[PDB]
Amino acid sequence: MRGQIRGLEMASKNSQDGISLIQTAEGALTETHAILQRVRELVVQAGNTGTQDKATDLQSIQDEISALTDEIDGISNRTEFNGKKLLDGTYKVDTATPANQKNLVFQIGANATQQISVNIEDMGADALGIKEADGSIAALHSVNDLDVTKFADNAADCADIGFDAQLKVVDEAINQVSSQRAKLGAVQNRLEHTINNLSASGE
Amino acid sequence: MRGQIRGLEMASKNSQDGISLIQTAEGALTETHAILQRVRELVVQAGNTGTQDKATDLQSIQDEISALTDEIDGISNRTEFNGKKLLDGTYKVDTATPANQ
Amino acid sequence: INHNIAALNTLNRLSSNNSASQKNMEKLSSGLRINRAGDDAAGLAISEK
Amino acid sequence: INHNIAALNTLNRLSSNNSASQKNMEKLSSGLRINRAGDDAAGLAISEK
Amino acid sequence: INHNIAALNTLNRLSSNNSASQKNMEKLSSGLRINRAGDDAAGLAISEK
Amino acid sequence: NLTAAESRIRDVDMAKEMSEFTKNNILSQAPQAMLAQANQQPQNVLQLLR
Amino acid sequence: NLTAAESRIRDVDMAKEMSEFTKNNILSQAPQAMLAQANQQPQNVLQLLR
Amino acid sequence: NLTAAESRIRDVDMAKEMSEFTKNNILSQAPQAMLAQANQQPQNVLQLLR
């Protein structure tokens, strides 16, 4: 019994550390999110203002979107929690193989197998989830931001340089943010209720 | 008489251990309970919001409900009291037979 | 007893209450019921959109 | 705790709110939404031209 | 006996209790469960980082 | 009206969350005093059973 | 939130460590009186077996 | 804007430094009472081991 009580208390510590981690990465994705809101403001405002704006003006906005870009790489990179670049999109990709996943498991029970699985995948190079960074689109309008002068060449129809690919990349990118944040918060629910069973059962 | 007194005292110990066991499993079911309250909040909130929500959004909620799900398996499993997975539903089923109770 | 005390529940209820009043602080502070957490994941992702 | 407190978020939300009400001051004061900052860079450079 | 007494255990349990209440003092005093000792070495080195 | 929709997720019934704020505060000041009583009773074991 | 992580190592459940503080104090006042009794019983060996 | 730069060295987050002010005050009222307990325990050595 003392075995189970001690191990369970230290397990409560473990779980609270998990709550800390997921809280950090979550707030990081919150910042990513609000930034991408500003990005969509700059894709509507970089609607060429139809064509009312100039390649000069859109070069200016594009400088802004590269600043915010490397800020998003900044979120996916600076999040070195205990030295873990958790929002390294590399860190936990399912990959359709066990070749390299690095499942960010947690340990809960004072007995064996009582573990949790965690999934953390975002990066500034992550956008519309075709499978991966498709090409110049579906990851790299987040990174490279085709609104330089390609977006003056056309604005509707070419499906790569025509506002619609781009705004769609922003949309699904932000939805990837949403989905992962929902996963993280789900984990936080499980850890709260988990500490409740640990603390009262252990009591 | 000393037979009955001694055996009865140790029986009091036995019964208090029983109170301990049932107290543990009970609090475990309390946690299960409150979790399922949240589940009904997520079945009303997963009323599709009528249909106002999306399959994306409900995929998110469903991720949450699978988390809470394996938490409920977590209660029915982690409750290894003296090594007894008491909330193993298997452990004491009546089964309509004495084959295994 | 002199070895365990039985108001350990009190510590757990005080801990949960710390989570509660702290939580209500966090919401009144920002003036927001939406969670930074993915808690209320659909409310989050919808409101984001 | 007695070592950290948890309404540090409150300091951050109050800081952001200082940025916000200060910002709205700066705009109402000059009577201008245009930023001295290159914030709204295209609105700036266009309006300059 | 008149040569040894058998509540020497009592001295050992009182000594351990001195370590215990002294320990809880040291933690409540600083307001810290972290040990100056490398006791909880990983909690230490992590929290340091 | 979309902003109305935005509110009805994120908006706070500040009266409500104040009520739960002080409710929780009361239930965080109370069990403290209970912990006092629990950590005060055995003193009479030491001092009056002995 | 890193500071939250910093707390969940170093932070004290002051109620808890107070409970173990007085618990240990009681178990440090008790065995003392036991040592009294042990260092008091053989006096009746000297004074009543002799 | 230079004055802004002047502030971002010398300026005080008065909320912050108030938080550390009362935090430190609490951690200066606490160890005092601990010093009481430490300077009160051996009295039972004198008075109950003896």
Residue numbers in the entry:
A (entry chain W): 52 to 254
B (entry chain g): 52 to 152
C (entry chain A), D (entry chain J), E (entry chain M): 3 to 51
F (entry chain A), G (entry chain M), H (entry chain C): 255 to 304
Give excerpts from the publication.
There are three parts to the flagellar structure: the trans-membrane basal body that functions as the motor, the connecting rod and hook, and the flagellar filament that acts like a helical propeller. Our current understanding of supercoiling in bacterial flagellar filaments, referred to as polymorphic switching, is based upon the notion that protofilaments within the flagellar filament can exist in two discrete states, that differ slightly in length. The “short” state results from a protofilament having a right-handed inclination (the R-state), while the “long” state results from a protofilament having a left-handed inclination (the L-state). To reconstruct filaments at high resolution, all protofilaments must be “locked” into the same state, either L- or R-type, producing straightened filaments that lead to non-motile bacteria.
While the three L-type mutants (E115G, S285P, and S17P) have a left-handed 11-start helix, the four R-type mutants (N226Y, A233V, H84R and A39VN133H) have a right-handed 11-start helix, and the designations L and R correspond to the hand of these 11-start helices. The L-type 11-start helices are tilted left by ~ 1.7° and the R-type 11-start helices are tilted right by ~ 3.9°. Strikingly, we found those sites are not necessarily conserved among different species or participate in unique inter-subunit interactions. These include three straight mutations outside of the D1 helices: S17P, S285P (both within D0) and the double mutant A39V/N133H (within the loop region). We also detected two mutations, S17P and S285P, located in the middle of the small coiled-coil D0 domain. Therefore, mutation S17P or S285P in B. subtilis forces a local bend of ~ 30° in the helix axis, and this conformational change makes the D0 coiled-coil adopt an L-type form more easily. Here our high-resolution reconstructions expand our knowledge and we can now observe how mutations in D0 can cause a switching of the flagellar structure.
